[PDB]
Design a protein around this ligand. Sequence first.
Ligand code: GTP
Ligand code: GTP
Ligand code: ATP
Ligand code: ATP
Ligand code: ZN
Ligand code: ZN
Lengths: 611, 466, 464, 191
Amino acid sequence: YIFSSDTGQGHLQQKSVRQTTLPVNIVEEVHEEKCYPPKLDEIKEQLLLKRLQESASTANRSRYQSRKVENMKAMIIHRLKEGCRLYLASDTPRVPSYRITYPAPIYSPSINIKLSNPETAVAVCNEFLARNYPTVASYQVTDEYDAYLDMVDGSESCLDRATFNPSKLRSYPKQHSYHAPTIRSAVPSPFQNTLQNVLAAATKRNCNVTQMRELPTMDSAAFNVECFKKYACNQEYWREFASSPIRVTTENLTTYVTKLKGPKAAALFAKTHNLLPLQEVPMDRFTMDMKRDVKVTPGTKHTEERPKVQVIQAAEPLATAYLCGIHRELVRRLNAVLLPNVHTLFDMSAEDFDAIIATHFKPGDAVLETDIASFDKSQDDSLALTAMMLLEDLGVDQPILDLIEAAFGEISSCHLPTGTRFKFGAMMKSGMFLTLFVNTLLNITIASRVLEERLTTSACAAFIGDDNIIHGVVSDALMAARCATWMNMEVKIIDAVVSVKAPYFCGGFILHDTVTGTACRVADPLKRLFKLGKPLAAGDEQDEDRRRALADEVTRWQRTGLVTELERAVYSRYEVQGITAVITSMATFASSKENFKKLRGPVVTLYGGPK
Amino acid sequence: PVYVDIDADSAFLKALQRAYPMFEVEPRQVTPNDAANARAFSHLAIKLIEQEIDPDSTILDIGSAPARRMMSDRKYHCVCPMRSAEDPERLANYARKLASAAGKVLDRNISGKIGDLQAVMAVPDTETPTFCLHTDVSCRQRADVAIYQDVYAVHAPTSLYHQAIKGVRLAYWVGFDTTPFMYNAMAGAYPSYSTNWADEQVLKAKNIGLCSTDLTEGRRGKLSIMRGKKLEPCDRVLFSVGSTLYPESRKLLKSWHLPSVFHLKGKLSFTCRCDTVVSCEGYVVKRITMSPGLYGKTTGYAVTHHADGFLMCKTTDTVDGERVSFSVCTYVPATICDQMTGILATEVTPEDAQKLLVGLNQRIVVNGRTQRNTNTMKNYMIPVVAQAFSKWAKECRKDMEDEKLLGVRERTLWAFKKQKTHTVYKRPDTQSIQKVQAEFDSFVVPSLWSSGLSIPLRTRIKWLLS
Amino acid sequence: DPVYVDIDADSAFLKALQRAYPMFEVEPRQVTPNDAANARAFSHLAIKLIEQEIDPDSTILDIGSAPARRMMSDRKYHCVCPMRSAEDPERLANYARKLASAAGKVLDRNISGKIGDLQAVMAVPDTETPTFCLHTDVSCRQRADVAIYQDVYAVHAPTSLYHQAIKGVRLAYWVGFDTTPFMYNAMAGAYPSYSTNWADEQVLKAKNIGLCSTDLTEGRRGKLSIMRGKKLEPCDRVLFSVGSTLYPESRKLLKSWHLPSVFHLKGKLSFTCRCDTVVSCEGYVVKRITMSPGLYGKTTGYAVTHHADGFLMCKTTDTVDGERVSFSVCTYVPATICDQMTGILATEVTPEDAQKLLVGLNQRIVVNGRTQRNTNTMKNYMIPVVAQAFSKWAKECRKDMEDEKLLGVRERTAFKKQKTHTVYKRPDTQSIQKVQAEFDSFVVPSLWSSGLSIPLRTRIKWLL
Amino acid sequence: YPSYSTNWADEQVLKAKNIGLCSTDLTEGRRGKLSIMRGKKLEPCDRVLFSVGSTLYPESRKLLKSWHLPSVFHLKGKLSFTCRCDTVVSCEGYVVKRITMSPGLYGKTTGYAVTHHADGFLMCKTTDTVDGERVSFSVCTYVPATICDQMTGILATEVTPEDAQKLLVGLNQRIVVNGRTQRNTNTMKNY
Ligand SMILES: Nc1nc2c(ncn2[C@@H]2O[C@H](COP(=O)(O)OP(=O)(O)OP(=O)(O)O)[C@@H](O)[C@H]2O)c(=O)[nH]1
Ligand SMILES: Nc1nc2c(ncn2[C@@H]2O[C@H](COP(=O)(O)OP(=O)(O)OP(=O)(O)O)[C@@H](O)[C@H]2O)c(=O)[nH]1
Ligand SMILES: Nc1ncnc2c1ncn2[C@@H]1O[C@H](COP(=O)(O)OP(=O)(O)OP(=O)(O)O)[C@@H](O)[C@H]1O
Ligand SMILES: Nc1ncnc2c1ncn2[C@@H]1O[C@H](COP(=O)(O)OP(=O)(O)OP(=O)(O)O)[C@@H](O)[C@H]1O
Ligand SMILES: [Zn+2]
Ligand SMILES: [Zn+2]
């Protein structure tokens, strides 16, 4: 997710495109990446398969999958191209674009410090938890009978416009096997797929009705786009972009499918026999998915109240494959119209982010961080109109806009195992292929309107998802009065000062180095610490990608000139002392395969076995 | 309101309030004493006792400090022999206080007290309504109430009988609980009052609460005398309350574990009872009522009710360079015992039990604040407690795989086998019963009295009272 | 009512002083950057406490005290000041200078009375005076009832106490260092809270102890000298260093003040005595002794010490004068550190691992409003030796559980003795020692001579 | 004495290469030359040169060591006196002492001197080239107290000299007192 996940896969790429070998900033030109067209070959597969049988040590098998997957990719292109005959177009001359590059970052040396006995590391971590979090360290006294306790008490829900069968509401637990954790953090296990959990998750009541597409709604949207184009964008690209539309093209589909992996291509291939046309695919029908992981934050709140259940609304598989070739062009056009001091995390890597903010943040500087998650976007219909107006200005072809618009109105969801039907009104968060883009556009628009001209005169601004940071801005009564037109809790704002109250961004800390004198971003150690106290399901063999992720994260923590700063940042955020010992404990855990085995224990089986 | 001299922020306030629901306890500290908890309980207990009885009654004090009962509204008669080193200092202190207040408080019969003291100093053998120099046997004053406060140097059946023939119908006793001494233990502790006691034979131990040892290198073989080959408790026991040392004897301690009902024969016959009124983590208050005649029958049983956890296990320690084994005992808080029942269903190693106890101990009412966070139990007794639980779980398992027939015993012709027992664990809300003696018909009096007062001491008191 | 001390405002020692004296209020006032500020603050508060409970209009005897420090007091004092140290001539001159300069301005405290008594003593050096004296503790003839000892380590306690009780003294007080480490026969020790170090005279050329000094060398593969050793045991020579001042002392006189609970004094007259401890704070103790004529009770001959902080004693290896030897070192540990190490000592820890955890646990608290953001609970120079001791303790405890005997019986051959390398007294634990409680032999030489010189007499008379 | 910009050295090592008071010249490595005298010994002599800022002072070891007086000592002659010596104020190696003298002989002496360290003190062996010839001698210096406290954890194991140098540099730069302008704020001199 964004920077890096627990398995070190992340959402960002790993190729630098914003690096230069000169001590000054240089403007360059954006180019295109050529893609190899797949080709079909059956005679090679037949002979290789027979040659696979006679001798295959290690690389002989790999040639078979590469040949087999390559055949599947060619077949998908041939079938997919025929469906969208009424929307296919050709290549028109492109509009050139330019971008700015920055010099490479400088880092301080790192020294490794670790203990020897792995059991002592567990004792230190347990001592740290008890001293700082007394209630959390005394919760576990028996096994994990959460499923049984949830069945004993009844079902409480707050639904709206839903139907279900009462005869299928039964929640007797099934077999559950896991490994007993060693760290005394009480991280819950993922929930079981039952009808009771589905109703508990859908306990949200956002029933609000306003003017759908009337005159007052249009007036608010018209003002919003005016502020965005006046305080956050330059005027050198609008007229050129309107002349050249964006349409579905063979190159878009060929490039997209080639980027998929093995298993993903096979899954898509299985749904190409009865291929519906593009105009036949419904755009307002979704399916319900439950398989998720619970989210826990440092503190003592999960030992008193049960956490919520996460859900996913999945769209049609063919809908996200026909039109997913226009995401790259939309990103390029958006980056071209933004001001040089306004940045977006799309199409960047970890190193590029460090080089941009290398010489901007210094001690004693005020930074404003604001999130917009706590806001009901379903109350006002103008939030959807504003996004469409921005999309139309960017140069989206007219019939394609109708297909996109159909997914932002009335939608329905269904649960296949139980046949449960749900209906929702205007919704912004979903599982479609424009979710981050629309959220980023709305985040910039909200900030631009509230801050007015204070956004233009700034040193560095970064926007991604629902989080943002703006340099050199404080909190005054003018923004409170402007934002209090409807209510007061639209957004949450926090004031931060470098080297005194470290700013928080995307689950990390922004710190200023001492030896070199440059800014850098590091991860959150407490978030990792609670995560090692999560039970591991039996039969899982993913205990090697996590060790490498921990090893990389530990090295970044032990850089010289950042030990003292990290201590103060954690204390000013969570009011906790003594994290250097925890970091040392993490170092010895991620040193060998056998040292990582001390975080687990004997296997415990519940609700299973007729003995 | 009742004021106690303990710290305003400590965990002992809740226990005192719960054990005395008819009062109001307010902390007010003026002295950093090392035995504040011990003195606080005694102050409350004596206030309750004097409040439960009617006024205009005469009261005897066996172990008496006259300065303590000087500003009271009751009628106390003090019995003060001269058999202790504390006695000369207390007598001089009493005289100084009396002479220092003669025209300030004319409400407690100060003039009478001074006159009675002077009369005794003239003739040592005289008896006065307030002071005397006899013992509990040689005193000849009539009353109906007797009070014992921290007395461990008398024989209970003999002392009680001599008080009955003088018209006493009620008695009170305040002191330590005598349950651990009925189990024939070697050492023990009272964590709530910072009290440690140990037998004289293990004073050179290494890892107990009252010991001292040196540093040695190690030698194989030493010169010695005829082999002992035994290690059993003796009659001498040493007590340490705070920083003060008290020697005691086992026989006189066990004599106060009186049965529910017993008879006192002899020249005159009486029937007796015994009940426990207040109990708080080691201190008890007992009430004894006596009546002439002979009624009912006796069973000779004693019952103790446990509101906390009681533990007794076997430990291995090095005494004077030699490895031996003996037994210890202690008390455990109720909350800790209640939360350990989920892990004792299986077999656990001592290391695992220790880790759970540590994590479960820092949980305190004031949470992360370390002002009132004195922990649930003292940390120096955790290692020994962890071993006891591990041994208990192992023994509770072997019983399950050796089920037998219902009703009949098994001898494999003769020589039935006995099993090992290494720990005794009494859970809260349980009772313990022992067999004792409940009939006494052997009373002897020396009938000889020797004075203990000296000439220079008498002169000093006379000068002070001048 | 408020009490002023010469202590820096934002210091960690203020909390300890407040808890030890709950009946007062303490507020700092620093005027001097002394190197032993903590040592003097305790003594100042102790004197105020002692004089508060005693009955007024009563005479008090001072043994080996400087009369200058007691001139503004509103009590009756009798100073016993012999001439046996290099400190005395300076103190006498200072006392006369202050006394002369205070005439007339202070119309109280009997200034005009004792100002004429000093010259009377100088005229004839063998006269008694209700304010001044020139004999020893066993030669003075003044009669009183209260005696006070303050930082006195050069007298034999049974002998000195008996002579004072003959004159009719029923109360005594003692203020000084704790004598517990000297009952364990240690070679070196420390008092980290008061910046005090002490070492034996045979280890003054060590390398890694509190008080030592060494030099650089290259190494000689075999050196023959005219000295024969194979012995290394404590002797009767100890050096104390408080701040920057040096004090030589002897072990025999130090152990004499570790009195039991009850003891008897038998001679021409007989008395019974008791010893209690009133105030204790990280090394300083205050003892109250009461005396009464006659024979009463019985004695057992035991001494009891109560530990509020952890007491540690271990065996260390060092290099003395180029040669490698081994001896024992003792120190004190704070209570909070000992409580947080309970869970770690259950496992097996190497000395390297134990040192790292102690350093991490040391720097803590981190007050921002008060003092500095970085604060240390204990002095850092004692961590290496402490971490070594815990490692040895954990190993010995584990080896006993793996070798359990039977209940009641001991097996002989006349038995094998195991090795012991660490003694650890946890908080809220008592230690017991055996001493002598019956004294009957007293010697009074009384060969007193006037230890005074003509030039000193002339200076005092002319200055006064 | 880094806090006062003072450097002192022996007269025999004035041609060293890497100390605070020395001077040398470039050479190519001409090997050879013969003489009659054979030194074979490098020990301190009675000639010390002091440099406070830009001013030079020559001193003698015997007179410098004569001021290290003990706690108590006696003066005997036509008249006899007894006297003491005390230290009043000290700040990074520049102290003030007080002596009180009285007539007559009292007490007894022991002949010991005590020094109290409020900050670290080092004396180590170093290797350098004096006039092109490699030799070894000893150097001493002072260390700030806060630096010594923070190095306790690292010195628990075996650490190479280069690793210790990198750690010391990182600890030297300190930021809380800079006032956002001073920036550098060196705790100790880098040389
Ligand atoms: N084992 C035993 N404990 C005693 C005895 N006398 C008193 N105690 C207890 O020891 C505690 C501390 O008493 P101290 O204050 O040190 O001695 P004290 O001179 O008797 O003064 P008070 O007990 O306050 O009257 C008391 O509270 C008693 O509970 C005794 O004779 N034997
Ligand atoms: N071991 C030992 N310690 C002493 C002795 N006398 C004093 N001390 C302690 O050392 C500390 C140093 O005190 P000083 O700085 O010398 O000042 P002082 O206490 O007013 O007494 P003076 O020596 O006269 O200056 C005192 O506070 C005592 O606690 C002694 O004779 N032997
Ligand atoms: N009949 C009695 N016999 C013995 N002591 C009595 C009696 N009556 C009162 N006392 C008091 O009991 C107290 C304990 O006296 P004891 O003979 O036991 O000497 P002790 O050894 O100092 O005390 P302990 O044995 O409890 O430690 C004395 O103060 C004594 O005045
Ligand atoms: N028998 C004594 N009676 C009264 N005062 C004494 C006696 N002996 C020593 N003093 C006093 O002790 C004080 C200093 O101690 P001392 O006489 O032993 O000299 P010191 O050897 O220099 O110091 P230390 O006490 O460490 O041995 C002197 O002021 C002296 O008056
Ligand atoms: Zn009587
Ligand atoms: Zn005199």
